[PDB]
Design an enzyme around this catalytic site. Structure first.
Site, short mmCIF file in Angstrom:
data_model
loop_
_atom_site.label_atom_id
_atom_site.label_comp_id
_atom_site.label_asym_id
_atom_site.label_seq_id
_atom_site.Cartn_x
_atom_site.Cartn_y
_atom_site.Cartn_z
N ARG B 83 0.83 -1.19 0.00
CA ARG B 83 0.00 0.00 0.00
C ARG B 83 0.87 1.25 0.00
NH1 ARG B 83 -3.90 -0.89 3.77
NH2 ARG B 83 -5.64 -0.70 2.27
N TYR B 85 0.46 5.73 -0.23
CA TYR B 85 -0.43 6.87 -0.30
C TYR B 85 -0.56 7.32 -1.75
CZ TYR B 85 -0.35 7.29 4.78
OH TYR B 85 -0.50 7.06 6.13
N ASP B 117 -7.99 7.23 17.40
CA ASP B 117 -7.71 6.44 16.19
C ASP B 117 -7.22 5.03 16.51
OD1 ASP B 117 -4.26 7.35 15.04
OD2 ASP B 117 -4.95 6.43 16.89
N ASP B 122 0.44 10.38 15.94
CA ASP B 122 1.18 10.76 14.74
C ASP B 122 1.85 12.11 14.92
OD1 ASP B 122 0.17 8.43 13.37
OD2 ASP B 122 -1.70 9.53 13.04
N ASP B 154 -7.88 11.96 14.59
CA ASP B 154 -6.55 11.58 14.11
C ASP B 154 -5.65 12.81 14.16
OD1 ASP B 154 -4.38 10.29 13.00
OD2 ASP B 154 -5.20 10.21 10.97
#
Ligand SMILES: [Mg+2]
Ligand SMILES: [Mg+2]
Ligand SMILES: [Mg+2]
Ligand SMILES: [Mg+2]
Lengths: 232, 235
Positions: B83, B85, B117, B122, B154
């Site tokens: 995967r 982005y 999340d 992050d 998030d």
């Protein structure tokens, strides 16, 4: 209104989109598609947009101005590979027919005295529907961002496709900021940053990075139209 | 300083980055790296950042929390294909060790009551230098964007690497807006739009899309740190 003759496969070197009238007669999307599909006296004034890069794609499709009838194909790097942007473009993207960003004409210092980029005037269409490569749609101009791409003035006109549900509700920059959050800054930030991985460059924007109002952005299209007409 | 043990081939399904001390002892970047490299009383306050996705790349590298020592590998689709982005990320990106955005803990009305999340918190590092996969760098927290991804809160904390030339000059969002034009809106617009091609969704932002000040972003990290520590507690 215009016929797309698609050949090859979209991700390969043989891919090409050619345009013809509905008579079957071939025609150039740059030269022979009228910029004003219903004349200059229509209100709201509509401009024709030739779609090169569909919403949510990354291949650098463009009209091949060197070739007869200006077909749309994917740009090549010198290594001969098909060229892609480093990031996906989130809006339908293309150019206005019969327009030319004459490099011989110097901008004032609102644009760092940059010069025309030499290509047909670029337009970003912000509607929800994905438009195909080679599509021709009438759009209403909403505004314009004055990107400076390596000393070149590279306008990105913002427009909305006629037939989009929000067409009648979008008439200025403020309406877009109000009813479509992130579209104006998303387009500005996309074109500011998209050449960092390829060129290690962050682009600038003239006019204090503001999106010029719709009426001013219409005049940008007019000037590029006359530069084109003067070229012929 | 931590040692990166690189294995497999870049861009392939076997690629994997593991962390070890300079003793050779292996360790988890999520569990065994301290969140505060010089303690919570250090001034300026520093947080350690585990770099997962380097500046100017797009492969979805992440710590694999199920695996022993939580190595960094490329995320997989349900297809089992690697995967990526849809767009290149223009900044070093990763997570804070020993943090967990505990779901089931309800957010205020400024975040649409969205829940955690479920992942480590992050962080976006805005420095100029490209950092490697699995790098661990002390950062000063500058702010945070409250992105809402389908009812999930998030957070994207913004930080600056210690040793970057502008470190001592950047202490809050206002300094970034002043000395680094387009960085804050570039990050906001990146995470707002990046799942439109994959999921046909435009993300939202809590707190009226504002970049919360550094002090608020410090509290975001603390709360996620306590969620993690609570998972470890006895009694
Ligand atoms: Mg163009
Ligand atoms: Mg241009
Ligand atoms: Mg993460
Ligand atoms: Mg998160």
């Amino acid at each position: 209104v215009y016929r797309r003759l698609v050949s090859g496969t979209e991700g390969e070197k043989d891919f090409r989109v050619l345009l013809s009238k509905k008579s079957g007669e071939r025609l150039s999307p740059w030269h022979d598609i009228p910029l004003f599909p219903n004349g200059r006296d229509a209100r709201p004034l509509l401009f024709n947009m030739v779609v090169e890069i569909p919403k949510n794609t990354r291949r650098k499709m463009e009209m091949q101005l060197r070739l007869p009838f200006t077909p749309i194909m994917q740009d090549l790097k010198k290594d001969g590979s098909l060229r892609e942007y480093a990031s996906t473009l989130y809006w339908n993207y293309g150019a206005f027919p019969q327009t030319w960003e004459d490099p011989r004409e110097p901008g004032g210092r609102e644009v760092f005295h940059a010069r025309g980029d030499g290509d047909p005037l670029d337009v970003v269409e912000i509607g929800s529907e994905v438009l195909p490569v080679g599509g021709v749609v009438p759009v209403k101009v909403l505004g314009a961002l004055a990107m400076i791409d390596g000393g070149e003035l590279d306008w990105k006109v913002l427009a909305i496709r006629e037939g989009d549900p929000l067409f009648s509700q979008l008439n200025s920059v403020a309406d877009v900021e109000r009813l479509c959050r992130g579209v104006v800054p998303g387009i500005r930030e996309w074109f500011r940053w998209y050449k960092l991985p390829t060129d290690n460059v962050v682009n600038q924007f003239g006019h204090d990075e503001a999106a010029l109002p719709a009426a001013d952005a219409e005049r940008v299209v007019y000037r590029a139209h006359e530069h084109y007409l003067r070229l012929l």
